[PDB]
């Protein structure tokens, strides 16, 4: 249930567009290819079997889909936890991604991360 989901991780799990889905929190810019600050985190407050994987995607208009690394997880006990995912592609500092969400139940649902995010070659 999501009072026990949150009940679960108090304080650390944000909204996606998805009612079925929270995640973890990310940076709002970040380093390419450096290790993110928190393990990215998605939380199916639905049922999702063990095994289930679970795959992120980013990009924005000038760039449909920006390299990550690591960038599917799978599912034990409603959480997906990426163990090293890391944004590779760049933004460019004026421009940032939207994350995607996939959850390969059957069928597969997509789900956003709820901000942006910018990937520079410095960071912030
Ligand atoms: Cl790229
Ligand atoms: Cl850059």
Redesign the pocket.
């Known amino acids: 249930s999501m009072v026990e989901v949150l009940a679960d991780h108090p304080g650390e799990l944000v909204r996606t567009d998805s009612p079925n889905f929270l995640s973890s929190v990310l940076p709002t810019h970040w380093r390419?290819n450096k290790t993110l600050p928190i393990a990215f985190k998605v939380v199916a407050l639905g049922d999702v079997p063990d095994g289930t994987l679970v795959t992120v995607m980013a990009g924005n208009d000038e760039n449909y889909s920006a390299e990550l690394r690591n960038a599917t997880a799978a599912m034990k006990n409603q959480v997906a936890r990426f163990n090293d995912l890391r944004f590779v592609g760049?933004?460019?500092?004026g421009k940032s991604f939207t994350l995607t969400i996939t959850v390969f139940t059957n069928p597969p649902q997509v789900a956003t991360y709820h901000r942006a995010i910018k990937?520079?070659?410095?960071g912030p």
């Open positions: 390419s760049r933004s460019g500092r990937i520079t070659v410095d």
